[PDB]
C-alpha cells in the first residue's frame, strides 16, 4: 500500500566528482519526478519514511540504468522524498 506523490521539480545537486557533476546535468530528466511513499501516519521517524520512499521509488522506476545512475538517484530521490514528507507534514 504505497501511494505515489504528485510531480515535483527534480533538484539540482552538485557532486564532488567533475564527471558526476556533469553526468547529473545531462541525465537528470531520465530520473523520477514523482516519489512512492507509505503514508506519514505509519511513521514516527522521517528517516524511515525517506528510506522506504527511496527504496520503493527507485525499484518501481527500474521494474536502462548504470551504477552511476543509482548513486545519482540515491542522493537526489532522497531529497525528493524529504520534500514529499514536507508536503505530508504541512497537511
Interacting residue with Cl ion among 54, 72, 73, 82 (CB under 5 A): 54
Residues near Cl ion (CB under 5 A), total? 3
Interacting residue with Cl ion among 51, 61, 71, 75 (CB under 5 A): 51
DSSP letter string, 25-90: HHHGGGS-SS-EE--GGG-S-HHHHHHHHHHHHHHHTT----HHHHHHHHHHHHHHHHHHHHHHHH
Position with the least CB separation from Cl ion: 51
Smallest distance from Cl ion to CB 86, Å: 15
User: 5 near 35, Cβ under 8 Å?
Assistant: yes
78 or 85: whose CB is closer to Cl ion? 78
Cell reading at 57: 521509488
Asked if residue 35 binds Cl ion (CB under 5 A), the reply is no
* CA distance linking residue 29 with residue 37, whole number of Å: 21
Please choose, out of 12-20, 23-31, 37-45, 51-59, the segment that lies near Cl ion by the rule CB under 5 A: 51-59
- Summarize as ranges the residues that interact with Cl ion (CB under 5 A): 51, 54, 78
Amino acid at each position: 500500500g504505497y501511494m505515489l506523490g504528485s510531480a515535483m521539480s527534480r533538484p539540482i545537486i552538485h557532486f564532488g566528482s567533475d564527471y558526476e557533476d556533469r553526468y547529473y546535468r545531462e541525465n537528470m530528466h531520465r530520473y523520477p519526478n514523482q516519489v512512492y511513499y507509505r503514508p506519514m501516519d505509519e511513521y514516527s521517524n522521517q528517516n524511515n519514511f525517506v528510506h522506504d520512499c527511496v527504496n520503493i521509488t527507485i525499484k518501481q522506476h527500474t521494474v536502462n540504468f548504470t551504477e552511476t545512475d543509482v548513486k545519482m538517484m540515491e542522493r537526489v530521490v532522497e531529497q525528493m522524498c524529504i520534500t514529499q514528507y514536507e508536503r505530508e507534514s504541512q497537511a
